[PDB]
């Protein structure tokens, strides 16, 4: 049914553009990552991976 909007409508009736972000961070290959620079890889020495 019709969902028209009026500028004269007050709070609780104004349009509200909504975007949802759904994440699925799980044990799987990563495709989306943040801006973290990749450093060199070190072996046989204790590090904070």
């Amino acid at each position: 049914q019709s969902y028209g909007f009026r500028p004269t409508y007050g709070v609780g009736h104004q349009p509200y553009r909504v975007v949802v972000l759904s994440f699925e961070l799980l044990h799987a290959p990563a495709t989306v990552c943040g801006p973290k620079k990749s450093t060199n890889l070190v072996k046989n020495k204790c590090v904070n991976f």
Partner: protein, 49 residues
């Protein structure tokens, strides 16, 4: 629960609604834009003739 009953003409059957403007919807009977409920309308030409 509040119920209100009256009679109106054919061209003004849809006039009583939030955001509507005219004679009946403004000077005799106006619904608030946040009104909850609904209207029941039916022809009574057989009786009110």
């Amino acid at each position: 629960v509040y119920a209100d009953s009256f009679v109106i003409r054919g061209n003004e059957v849809s006039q009583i609604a939030p955001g509507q403007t005219g004679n009946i919807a403004d000077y005799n009977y106006k619904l608030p834009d946040d009104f909850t409920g609904c209207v029941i309308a039916w022809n009574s030409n057989k009786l009110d003739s």
